[PDB]
Amino acid sequence: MANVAVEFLVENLMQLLRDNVELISGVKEAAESLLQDLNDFNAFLKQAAKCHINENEVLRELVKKIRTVVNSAEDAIDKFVIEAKLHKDKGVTRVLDLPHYKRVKEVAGEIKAIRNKVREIRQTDAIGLQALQDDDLSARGSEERKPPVVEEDDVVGFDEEADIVINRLLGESNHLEVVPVVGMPGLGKTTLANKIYKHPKIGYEFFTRIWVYVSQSYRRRELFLNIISKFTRNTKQYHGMCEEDLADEIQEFLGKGGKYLVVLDDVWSDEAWERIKIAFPNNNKPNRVLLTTRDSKVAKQCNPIPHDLKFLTEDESWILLEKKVFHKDKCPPELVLSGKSIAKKCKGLPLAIVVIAGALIGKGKTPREWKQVDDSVSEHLINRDHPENCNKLVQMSYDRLPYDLKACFLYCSAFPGGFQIPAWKLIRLWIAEGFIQYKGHLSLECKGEDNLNDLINRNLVMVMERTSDGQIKTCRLHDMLHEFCRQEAMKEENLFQEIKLGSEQYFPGKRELSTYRRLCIHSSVLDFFSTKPSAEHVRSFLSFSSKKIEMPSADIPTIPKGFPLLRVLDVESINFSRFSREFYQLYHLRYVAFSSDSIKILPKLMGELWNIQTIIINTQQRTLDIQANIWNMERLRHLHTNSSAKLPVPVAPKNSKVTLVNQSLQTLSTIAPESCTEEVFARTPNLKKLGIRGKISVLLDNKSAASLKNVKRLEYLENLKLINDSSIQTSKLRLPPAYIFPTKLRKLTLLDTWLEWKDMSILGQLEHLEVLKMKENGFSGESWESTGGFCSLLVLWIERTNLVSWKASADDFPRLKHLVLICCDNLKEVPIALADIRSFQVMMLQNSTKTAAISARQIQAKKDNQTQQGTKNIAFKLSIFPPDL
Amino acid sequence: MANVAVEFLVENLMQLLRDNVELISGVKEAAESLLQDLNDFNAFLKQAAKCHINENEVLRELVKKIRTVVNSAEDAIDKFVIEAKLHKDKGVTRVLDLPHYKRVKEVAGEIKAIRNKVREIRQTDAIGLQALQDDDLSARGSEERKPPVVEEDDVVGFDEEADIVINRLLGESNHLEVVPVVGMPGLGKTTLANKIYKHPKIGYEFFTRIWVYVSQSYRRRELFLNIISKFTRNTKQYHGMCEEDLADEIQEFLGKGGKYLVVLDDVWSDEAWERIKIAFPNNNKPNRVLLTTRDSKVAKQCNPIPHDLKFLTEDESWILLEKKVFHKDKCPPELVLSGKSIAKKCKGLPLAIVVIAGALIGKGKTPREWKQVDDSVSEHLINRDHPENCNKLVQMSYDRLPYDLKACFLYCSAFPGGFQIPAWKLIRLWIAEGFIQYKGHLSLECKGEDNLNDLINRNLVMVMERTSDGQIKTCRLHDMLHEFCRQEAMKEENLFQEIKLGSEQYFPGKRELSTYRRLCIHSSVLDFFSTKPSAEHVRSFLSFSSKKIEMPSADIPTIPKGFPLLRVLDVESINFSRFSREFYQLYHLRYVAFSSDSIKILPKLMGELWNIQTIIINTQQRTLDIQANIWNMERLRHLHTNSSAKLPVPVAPKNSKVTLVNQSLQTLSTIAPESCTEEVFARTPNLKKLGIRGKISVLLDNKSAASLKNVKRLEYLENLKLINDSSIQTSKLRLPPAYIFPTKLRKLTLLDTWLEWKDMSILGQLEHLEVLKMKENGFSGESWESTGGFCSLLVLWIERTNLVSWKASADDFPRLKHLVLICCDNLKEVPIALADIRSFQVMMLQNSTKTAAISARQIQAKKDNQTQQGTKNIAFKLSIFPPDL
Numbered sequence A, B: 001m002a003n004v005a006v007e008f009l010v011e012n013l014m015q016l017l018r019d020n021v022e023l024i025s026g027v028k029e030a031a032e033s034l035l036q037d038l039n040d041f042n043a044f045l046k047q048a049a050k051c052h053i054n055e056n057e058v059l060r061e062l063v064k065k066i067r068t069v070v071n072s073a074e075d076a077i078d079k080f081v082i083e084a085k086l087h088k089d090k091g092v093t094r095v096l097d098l099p100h101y102k103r104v105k106e107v108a109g110e111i112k113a114i115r116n117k118v119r120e121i122r123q124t125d126a127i128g129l130q131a132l133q134d135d136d137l138s139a140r141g142s143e144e145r146k147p148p149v150v151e152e153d154d155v156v157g158f159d160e161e162a163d164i165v166i167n168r169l170l171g172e173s174n175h176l177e178v179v180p181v182v183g184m185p186g187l188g189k190t191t192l193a194n195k196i197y198k199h200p201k202i203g204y205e206f207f208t209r210i211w212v213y214v215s216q217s218y219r220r221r222e223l224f225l226n227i228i229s230k231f232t233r234n235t236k237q238y239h240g241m242c243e244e245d246l247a248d249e250i251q252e253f254l255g256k257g258g259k260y261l262v263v264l265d266d267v268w269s270d271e272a273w274e275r276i277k278i279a280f281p282n283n284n285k286p287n288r289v290l291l292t293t294r295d296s297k298v299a300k301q302c303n304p305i306p307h308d309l310k311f312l313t314e315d316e317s318w319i320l321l322e323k324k325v326f327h328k329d330k331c332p333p334e335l336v337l338s339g340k341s342i343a344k345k346c347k348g349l350p351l352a353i354v355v356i357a358g359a360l361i362g363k364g365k366t367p368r369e370w371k372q373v374d375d376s377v378s379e380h381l382i383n384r385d386h387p388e389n390c391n392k393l394v395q396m397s398y399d400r401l402p403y404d405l406k407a408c409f410l411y412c413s414a415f416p417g418g419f420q421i422p423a424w425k426l427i428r429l430w431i432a433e434g435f436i437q438y439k440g441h442l443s444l445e446c447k448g449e450d451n452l453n454d455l456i457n458r459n460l461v462m463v464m465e466r467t468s469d470g471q472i473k474t475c476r477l478h479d480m481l482h483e484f485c486r487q488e489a490m491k492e493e494n495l496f497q498e499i500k501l502g503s504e505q506y507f508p509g510k511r512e513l514s515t516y517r518r519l520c521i522h523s524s525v526l527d528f529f530s531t532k533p534s535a536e537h538v539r540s541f542l543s544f545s546s547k548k549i550e551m552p553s554a555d556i557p558t559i560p561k562g563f564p565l566l567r568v569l570d571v572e573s574i575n576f577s578r579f580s581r582e583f584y585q586l587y588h589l590r591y592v593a594f595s596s597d598s599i600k601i602l603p604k605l606m607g608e609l610w611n612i613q614t615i616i617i618n619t620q621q622r623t624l625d626i627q628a629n630i631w632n633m634e635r636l637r638h639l640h641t642n643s644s645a646k647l648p649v650p651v652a653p654k655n656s657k658v659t660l661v662n663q664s665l666q667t668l669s670t671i672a673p674e675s676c677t678e679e680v681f682a683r684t685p686n687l688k689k690l691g692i693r694g695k696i697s698v699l700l701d702n703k704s705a706a707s708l709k710n711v712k713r714l715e716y717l718e719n720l721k722l723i724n725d726s727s728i729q730t731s732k733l734r735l736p737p738a739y740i741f742p743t744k745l746r747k748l749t750l751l752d753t754w755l756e757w758k759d760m761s762i763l764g765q766l767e768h769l770e771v772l773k774m775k776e777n778g779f780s781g782e783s784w785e786s787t788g789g790f791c792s793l794l795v796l797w798i799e800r801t802n803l804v805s806w807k808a809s810a811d812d813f814p815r816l817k818h819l820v821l822i823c824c825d826n827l828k829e830v831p832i833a834l835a836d837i838r839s840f841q842v843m844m845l846q847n848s849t850k851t852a853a854i855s856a857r858q859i860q861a862k863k864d865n866q867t868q869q870g871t872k873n874i875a876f877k878l879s880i881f882p883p884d885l
């Protein structure tokens, strides 16, 4: 929507005028006039939106040439901004310094020319309401959208096929065979496969099972690294092995553990199946593999008897539609007829129902809306096998979307098809692109998360992993939806443009690149940067590669000089040996994510990019030294980093009354313990997530417990993470008193701390803490006896600890929901009192002692009895990773 | 509720531990113990609340005494705090301050005794905790509540009485007669009176209408001065004029203006009517007085033909109850029988029905709850004449009320009965007393506002005036509810005790004053403070008087010495000429409201009190030079004042990296323009309401300090006020560009600005500004021609302007809903284009040109036709000051 670009330009111009006046002093008057006209045309575009746009070419023409003028104004303003900053760099004290000054205010003359063009547009419709405001539709208020709790986990109508396949399993013991699952894309084949892969009988028959995604454009070596990594604790030895040596290692590991079932999803081509099949040992075991392929030919090649997947019936279609739209409630009688008719028209494709239900929940719950959508679906689905019909359905659903969500939904497809998108990354990117403008009181991150939840609720985005606390971790768009979004954003809206090197595709030259606004490179990027490309009007650069691609020492200056107006730079997959001097002139940089392996310092000149919001640094070094003054940066909002980051000691200016209190800051992933001083925590009043990585002894030492004492000050802190790197238990550590931990702390994670289980009482004294995760021997001891306190704890996660005896009563954990017990090889028993917790929903046991498994089974039986006794107790599910335990 | 005391103690203790260790260094261990045992006691009390403590005697005792130890622990800890700060004052640099350290350690011995007493009882609490937890009830989550917009304004089945009354008037012209209104309390007589006082026929016949409240304890001169205040601005002169001569002036003012109606509200005794009737001239005109009384004898004396109020009929009862319970929505069929039975059981007393509706709202909307309510009401309403039936009904409603809200109703009674409680003051009290605890993310004030709105929704608190934008401005408790709340809070929970004295009675002695927690004095207070009283366990002192009482120069230091452990000091109605030293030693002070007339300098030592939230100062001086380092009082949240305060110039400490950035702050009501400086705004990042008073020119002048520019920094500001005191128009003032104003600004007010009507475009450019109030010639000029911009503006308020020609199109004010044209004696007419605005509902035209009023009637007729034309247009209301128009 043009509204988005207009609003972002307005906001950026206002910010420029307020904060830095000198930069805009030369042009400030033209800037202000442009800003007024921008507000006016934002209102104009809103009105034009009120009227049907896709049903009128004249309307689109009207809004057109506002977008072009806006882009020209944007580019002129940015070029002047950078030029004036270079003038400041020149530091020319001369009152009249014509060189570059004539031409810079002549860029201001480009700004004035575009200002005049904006004025001419204003003239064309001085009112802007001459004929358009006369018409307005969809006038209504906006209501609340609610959180996306897990629902309809039951798969409608796929149990019969699942049973058929699970019967197809173990047909001929002592042999390896592949079970083909065939169906048109979007028929739910991967849903059936996932259901089977988690079925209890499947888990019990095969001790080992693996899920592998074989994209249309997979790479074999990554795939084998992925498969092996599950079985091995370390992949270092195999990182230097060849594809075939890797296959042999996989065969060995996989034959170690008896039988096995491997699921290969979306095997596009026969050649891929042939290339991969070698790693599976036909070891004369009753082994199996389940493949999901959209093509009948490859399915026949794999096995002459493919399992043809069935369309859902009309009754099943209606059931799924109602389930999706009304969740746990029931469809009002007046809407039942329309819903059933729609489901009938769907033809039974689960994806079609899942999308139409999204459209319905988007629109509303009145019979008129349902009649309208029924008419639309009748019109658009006359044919059956044409793949464009689902595209038309997606068009229907996407039309109703709010424009702010339309921008985000489009931007989602920038990621390579089949990529698992880190939700936090996606949200920080949205914020960096300005798609989410401050609307109300919610913090930006919270608003973005809400956006993502609405997207998922509509079903326009699929969820892959949920963090322990249940929120979203990684999501991906469906293949057809990904294609739709790619085509839409690339053609209709020109949001971004992809450069995929096919067997024949050759790099577009400078002239085509001049038109692009955002680049995404997901194929060989080193070849692209050997071209020494150039583009002034590319603002964003995205590269979501699979491998990590070193940057040649000669091509490093290609990114800055190639694009000097960059805003979003997502180059995590690209190792940089160092940073050229032209990185310190990308002044329009908001988001900057990259990787490295030899970077030990962030040079102070990085402190000049005054605009940046996010910073991500994935460096292998153990110690990273941030010399760049994060405090000077006025808008820093995130500082993720793996290494231990040593923040610069704050230094209040001797003659300035500026308080360097960054009020926007919201994260500091792994600051070093040595920089948890009082000042650092003074400067981040609104800090919402903190983590430390280093020698936790300095902090937790009482003789030096002033540091976690300092952490007592971040009133808003909600996520604390303590990570110990020192491998020597040079002394014992004691947790300071419970009152020292900020009162809202909801999530704590401990790793290699070696604390006494007698300190669990302190964490019991915390009242809001809701997810506790201790890994790599966070707490040391053989006997632990729960003393209550965890009033609001929801997920308990113990991993790799030498605990032996655990004693607790039902009242120790009133609100426990998820219990994760990994690699506790030395715990004799699990207290049965836990069987008496109502919140206790799902239990997981992994690499644990046999007595623990026995006690867990007693707990399962006990909770089954409790539910059978009529008590409204939520369903219980137990999952021991090794079935034999 | 005990949980409230325990929670407040816990929070205060935790804060003391975190901030100041030296104060607690002596008894840190006992402090932390107390903290733990208090948390456990709070959990125990919650659990006991889950069960019905009243049902079991053992429970009543078990809950009992946990509170006493908590009260005992508070007294000892507070006394230690003050004694230790006194030690700091001594500054005894000796390593062992054996003299008087053994005194503060005597207090510490009290502390340690208390800690041991808590550990005891905690043991006694340990036993039986399981027996308590075995039982629970009302297991449910908490749902959202919604804002209380005006609803059910119409009065059920009362138009018969209204028309009968309006008929009674005009019986005998050229004569003065008073019409009695009789009925039991809460029967709605005031409702009927207000209905009549607003009826269009009444507003047309009598030009001069006056509404007067005559409490049980009125004071004649007070109301006479108020009546005079209606006709002329000031009352200070007549403050030097006798009551009978006041009455003469009232009679003259009233007789000059044609006919007159006056409503005397809630007349109790005959003598009061006799005394007050004097002011009304029987000048041989058709004038009437409408008195409402609960006694038949006074009514009969005033007239042998009293108007008995009628009970509501069963159908009327049910319609009223349904309207209250279900608001606009109709009753669900399954609850109709229960609702009708309940209404029938109320015997037609509107107050009983109203409280029952509140109770039903509190319970929910399930048939079981309605059956339970029906049973209960049948139980408690066997009798009719006994007034205690309504007390039982309010008790029934109260029991279902959350304890946070419960803490109110009872604290609401503290305000003197019949007093109009300023909502903002009430909320800041709430906060200061600690009744409102951080639960979530809403700013404290917002949580208070929602509490108050919920109280109104349950109908327990009746509202009196709303601000222009509609948010509540002034509420009070109904008489029956007030007596119920006062008795309850004084007896059951001992929240506070009133000291008001009867004839032949004496002020309670020091022994009695030793068992008080809060003092409310609403009668002679100078007499009380001439007793030289003394109490150590009084934390709050409230004095909501009528007249401003001075404090004798010899009797000043009674309060600081009478009570040294004060928190709330609400002495707004007591004029202090100076402050004693013993006042500065008060350290437990949160709230401090007081008046004055000669106080020009806020003392420096006043800045030592670390714990203050609010500050109110009604100094008559024009300037109030503040020298208290507000920057150092870390909990400061308001600095209300009326004169032009001058905040101290901030200075970041030379040798401390601690930034003096207050982030709780919310308002700096009336600072001086000289103190609208950069730093003063850097130090208050979260400021949410600013006002200025002084020579607005120095702001609008850029040479002194770009101060209205500096206002740009307060990203959260939402209420601005520019008050100009300079009466000399030295030069014209020009508003800065619209981008300077904070983006969220939602309310602006300009008095004496004398800005040129051309600038109104700048205020048009603002996008959220919702209420513009220009009073006493805000803008100077004679021709105003709207150019648009006020997209979101909702209320327009013009007072005392020389505007002659106003030109506008319907597109300039799309969202307008309220228009106020006060004292526009030079304006000719208002653009009829406003008649086309759908949102336009209410417009008030006071003391303006008759041509403007004719245009107003044209607008009214046009909107009448518009609504008649089938458009879903909201009802329109026209208010015109003089009847002839």
Ligand SMILES: O=P(O)(O)O[C@H]1[C@@H](OP(=O)(O)O)[C@@H](OP(=O)(O)O)[C@@H](OP(=O)(O)O)[C@@H](OP(=O)(O)O)[C@@H]1OP(=O)(O)O
Binding pocket: A467, A468, A473, A640, A669, A719, A721, A748, A749, A773
């Ligand atoms: O600390 P944990 O409870 O073990 O959770 C971590 C943490 O994420 P959260 O604290 O937000 O939950 C890490 O956060 P970052 O390091 O990315 O800031 C994240 O990443 P790492 O793997 O690099 O530690 C990691 O991911 P994973 O689950 O893959 O181990 C995992 O996140 P979740 O708990 O959200 O899944």
Ligand SMILES: O=P(O)(O)O[C@H]1[C@H](OP(=O)(O)O)[C@@H](OP(=O)(O)O)[C@H](OP(=O)(O)O)[C@@H](OP(=O)(O)O)[C@H]1OP(=O)(O)O
Binding pocket: B424, B467, B468, B473, B669, B691, B719, B747
């Ligand atoms: O209700 P108040 O607390 O008395 O304040 C509001 C207004 O501010 P807001 O409109 O933002 O609420 C002014 O602010 P303050 O003076 O209270 O700081 C106030 O000014 P004055 O009291 O000096 O007149 C004015 O007073 P008034 O009610 O007499 O108009 C009154 O106006 P509203 O209640 O209509 O908002």
Ligand SMILES: Nc1ncnc2c1ncn2[C@@H]1O[C@H](COP(=O)(O)OP(=O)(O)O)[C@@H](O)[C@H]1O
Binding pocket: A154, A155, A156, A157, A158, A184, A185, A186, A187, A188, A189, A190, A191, A192, A320, A349, A350, A351, A352, A354, A459, A462, A478
């Ligand atoms: N049996 C089913 N019940 C409900 N939804 C289903 C079912 N089968 C498929 N779907 C939905 O159909 C859509 C397409 O399936 P998906 O799992 O995304 O990929 P695939 O088509 O490869 O199976 C998704 O929204 C999926 O949840």
Ligand SMILES: Nc1ncnc2c1ncn2[C@@H]1O[C@H](COP(=O)(O)OP(=O)(O)O)[C@@H](O)[C@H]1O
Binding pocket: B155, B156, B157, B158, B184, B185, B186, B187, B188, B189, B190, B191, B312, B320, B350, B351, B354, B462, B478
């Ligand atoms: N139809 C009605 N007639 C009278 N009061 C009504 C009616 N409907 C609701 N009420 C409410 O019942 C109460 C009537 O008594 P009230 O006016 O409070 O007492 P009093 O007349 O003694 O001041 C008010 O709260 C009023 O708003």
